[PDB]
C-alpha cells in the first residue's frame, strides 16, 4: 500500500 | 455526550495520556469531547484529533482488508461453501469503520470547517474531510460510490487551492495533503498518471524551497518529501 | 447476551476470523458467546478463548503500567500538581481491566471448571483462573489484596497438583502453568527463591523426558522450556 | 517483565 499521512 | 461533564483542558490532558498508553479509541473519544465544547482547536489540538482517529480507522481498514481478502478467496472457483459468516463479519467491521468515518465527518461539518479561517486550520480540516471520504470510498460498492468519491475529490481540491495560494511549497500540511490526494488519484480515482504528476510536481517545488528553511523545518519537510519519493518509486 | 442468537459453530468460525484480523476484542466476545452456549470446549476452542482474552487483558495491562508510572512520577518531590486527571484515567483503565478479569473468572466459574474432568481441560482452566486472579492482584491495593493473591495461589496450586499426577513433565500445559506460577511467586508473592526453584525443577524434569517425544512435541515443549531458562537468566 | 504464556 502507498504512503499517506 | 459522555464527555459533556469533563473540562476541555482535562479532555486534552487525557487525550495525551491515552496516546502515551496507545489507547487510541480513548484518545479519539476524549478529542471528540473536546471538539464538542464548541471552541476552535489549536495546532497541537488538531493534531491530537487527527492522530487519534487515524489510528482507530487505520486498525479498522487493516482488519477490513484481511476479511475482504478471505471473502474474495471464498468466491473463487473450487472454494468450499462455508456459509454467511465471512460476509457477515466483514460487514460488521465495515459498518464500524463507516461509523467512525461518519463521526469524523460530523465533527468537521459541525462545526470545525466553518469556523476555520486561517490557511493552516482550514487546509488541515479539508484534508481530513478528503481522507475520511476516501476511507468510505475504499469500502463503497453501491449507488452512492461515485458521489462518495466526488466528495473526497472536492474536499481535497478545495484544500489544494487554498494551500497553493496561502502556504509555501514546503509547508508540511501542504505536502501531506498532496501526498494523500496523489494516493486518492492512484488508488480511488483510477488516475495513476495524475497521481504521479502530482507527486513529482509537489516534490520538485518543495525541493526548490528547502533553502529558505531552518534545520528543524527542513527535517520535517524532507520526511514527507521522502514519502512522495517512496510512492513515486512504487508507481514507476 | 448479544451472541445468544448466533450459532455456536458460527461464533467459533468468527473467532478465528477475528484472530486473523487481529480483532481480539471481537474474538473474545465471540468466544464468550460460544462458552455461554453451555457445551464443553475442545482443545482448539479452549485455546481460542485463552488467546482472545490474553491479548485483550495484555493490552490493558500495558496501558495500566504506562499510566501507573506517570502517576508515580507525579507524586515525587518537585513534581508540579496537574490535578486529578492522571489518577482518574488510570482508574478508568484499571476498572476496565478488572471488568475483563471478572468476565473471564465468571466464565470459568459458570461453568467451565465444574464440567472439566480430563486433566488437559481442568488444568488449562485452573491455570486461567490463577492468571486472571494474578492480573487482579497486579492492580490491587485494598483490603482484599491478600485474598486476591491467595485466590491466584489456590488455583495455581490445584492445577499444579493435578498436572504432576496426570501429565508428563513435558506437557505444554504443565510447562506453561509452572512458568506462570513461578512468575506469580516472583512478582506477586514476594517469593523469588520459590520462583527460581520452581522454574529450575520444572526445566530439569522436562529435559529428562524429552527423549520420549516426537519431533513436533519436542519443538513445542522446548519453546516453553526456553522461556523458563529466560526467566532464570533474568533472576540469577 | 518476565515471560508468561
Ligand atoms: C499546525 C500543524 O498542523 N502542523 C503540522 C502538522 C503535521 C506535521 C507532520 N509532519 C510530519 C512529518 C512526517 C510524518 C508526519 N508528519 C506530520 N503529521 C501528519 C500530517 C497531518 C496533516 C498534514 C500533514 C501531515 F504530515 C507537522 C506540522
Ligand atoms: C489442548 C491444549 O491445551 N494444548 C496446548 C496448549 C498450549 C500450547 C502452547 N504451546 C506453546 C509453546 C510456546 C508458546 C505458547 N504455547 C502454547 N500456548 C500458550 C499456553 C496456554 C496454556 C498453557 C500453556 C501454554 F503454553 C500447546 C498445546
Ligand atoms: Ca469549562
Ligand atoms: Ca459456516
Ligand atoms: Ca456494507
Ligand atoms: Ca475562526
Ligand atoms: Ca501563508
Ligand atoms: Ca517500481
Ligand atoms: Ca444451535
Ligand atoms: Ca489538570
Ligand atoms: Ca481502582
Ligand atoms: Ca466433562
Ligand atoms: Ca496423562
Ligand atoms: Ca541476570
Ligand atoms: Cl458478525
Ligand atoms: Cl477518565
Summarize the topology.
The complex is a heterotetramer, with 2 copies of chain A (5 residues) and 2 copies of chain B (236 residues).
Chain A (H helix, E strand, L loop, with lengths): L5
Chain B lengths: L7 H13 L3 H12 L7 H32 L10 H31 L3 H21 L5 H22 L5 H17 L3 H16 L7 H21 L1
Bound molecules: ligand A1I0W (2 copies), calcium ion (12 copies) and chloride ion (2 copies).
Please sum up the structure shown.
The complex is a heterotetramer, with 2 copies of chain A (5 residues) and 2 copies of chain B (236 residues). With 5 residues, chain A is largely without helices or strands.
Structure report:
The complex is a heterotetramer, with 2 copies of chain A (5 residues) and 2 copies of chain B (236 residues). Chain A has 5 residues and is mostly loops. With 236 residues, chain B is an all-alpha fold. Chain B has one domain: 14-3-3 domain (Delta-Endotoxin, domain 1, Up-down Bundle). Chain B contains 9 helices and no strands. In chain B, helix 1 runs antiparallel to helix 2, helix 5 runs parallel beside helix 7 and helix 6 packs antiparallel against helix 7. Chain B is globular. In chain B, 41% of the residues are buried. Chains in contact: A-B, B-C, C-D. Chains B and C meet through helix 1, helix 3 and helix 4 of B and helix 1, helix 3 and helix 4 of C. The complex binds ligand A1I0W (2 copies), calcium ion (CA) (12 copies) and chloride ion (2 copies). Chains B, C: This is 14-3-3 protein sigma.
Amino acid at each position: 500500500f502507498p504512503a499517506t499521512v | 455526550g459522555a464527555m459533556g461533564s469533563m473540562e476541555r483542558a482535562s479532555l486534552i490532558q487525557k487525550a495525551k495520556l491515552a496516546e502515551q498508553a496507545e489507547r487510541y479509541e480513548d484518545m479519539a473519544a476524549f478529542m471528540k469531547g473536546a471538539v464538542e465544547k464548541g471552541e476552535e482547536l489549536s495546532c497541537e489540538e488538531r493534531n491530537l484529533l487527527s492522530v487519534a482517529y487515524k489510528n482507530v480507522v487505520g486498525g479498522q481498514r487493516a482488519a477490513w482488508r484481511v476479511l475482504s481478502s478471505i471473502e474474495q478467496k471464498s468466491n473463487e472457483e473450487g472454494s468450499e461453501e462455508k456459509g454467511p459468516e465471512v460476509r457477515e463479519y466483514r460487514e460488521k467491521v465495515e459498518t464500524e469503520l463507516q461509523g467512525v468515518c461518519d463521526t469524523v465527518l460530523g465533527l468537521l461539518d459541525s462545526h470545525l470547517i466553518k469556523e476555520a479561517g486561517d490557511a493552516e486550520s482550514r487546509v488541515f480540516y479539508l484534508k481530513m474531510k478528503g481522507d475520511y471520504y476516501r476511507y468510505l470510498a475504499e469500502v463503497a460498492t453501491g449507488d452512492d460510490k461515485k458521489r462518495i468519491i466526488d466528495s473526497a475529490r472536492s474536499a481535497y481540491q478545495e484544500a489544494m487551492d487554498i494551500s497553493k495560494k496561502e502556504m509555501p511549497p514546503t509547508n508540511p500540511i501542504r505536502l501531506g495533503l498532496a501526498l494523500n490526494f496523489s494516493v486518492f488519484h492512484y488508488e480511488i480515482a483510477n488516475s495513476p498518471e495524475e497521481a504521479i504528476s502530482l507527486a513529482k510536481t509537489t516534490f520538485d517545488e518543495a525541493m526548490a524551497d528547502l533553502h529558505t528553511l531552518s534545520e528543524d523545518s527542513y527535517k520535517d519537510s524532507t520526511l514527507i518529501m521522502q514519502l512522495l519519493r517512496d510512492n513515486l518509486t512504487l508507481w514507476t
